Amino acid sequence: HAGIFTFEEPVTHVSESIGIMEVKVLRTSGARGNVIVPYKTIEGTARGGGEDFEDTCGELEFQNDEIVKTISVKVIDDEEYEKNKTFFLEIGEPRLVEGRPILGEHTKLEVIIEESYEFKS
């Protein structure tokens, strides 16, 4: 009953102008105990280091009876263009804080950054 942890979905589209992207991690099928879920960003065709996004990583702590947490990623509205602009988040194996918590269905998330174009009326 410690929980099965998952992203909402495996692929998401966000605007280049979103500013802050808030990625959810859900705990399903049990919320007993304090658990951490490691996470990280990984570059795809989109670049980190504040080019298209700011890299981030850490451990999300779920307290007893807590079932949703948020990872906030800075998305930079890069003036430069790609046909398909992607990066990823991943969750890693959960750990009890000193049953067993595990990963569920969506453990990798592809983020597609959608580009918009400036036209004048």
| Resolution of this entry, Å | 1.5
Which domains, and CATH codes, for the chain? Answer: 1-121 (2.60.40.2030)
* Residue 22 is labelled as binding a ligand: no
Q: Which of 28, 7, 25 is nearest to 69 (CA)?
A: 25
Q: Which of 4, 14, 2 is nearest to 109 (CA)?
A: 14
* Residue 52 is labelled as binding a ligand: yes
Give the method of determination.
Answer: X-ray
Tell me the three-class secondary structure of the chain, residue by residue.
Answer: CCCEEEECCCEEEEECCCCEEEEEEEEECCCCCCEEEEEEEEECCCCCCCCCECCCEEEEEECCCCCEEEEEEEECCCCCCCCCEEEEEEECCCEECCCCCEECCCCEEEEEEECCCCCCC
* Residue 80 is labelled as binding a ligand: yes
| Main-chain dihedrals φ then ψ at residue 28, nearest 5 degrees | -120, 155
12: Cα within 13 Å, side-chain hemisphere:
18
CB atoms within 10 A of CB 42: 14
* Residue 55 is labelled as binding a ligand: no
Specify the length of the chain in residues: 121
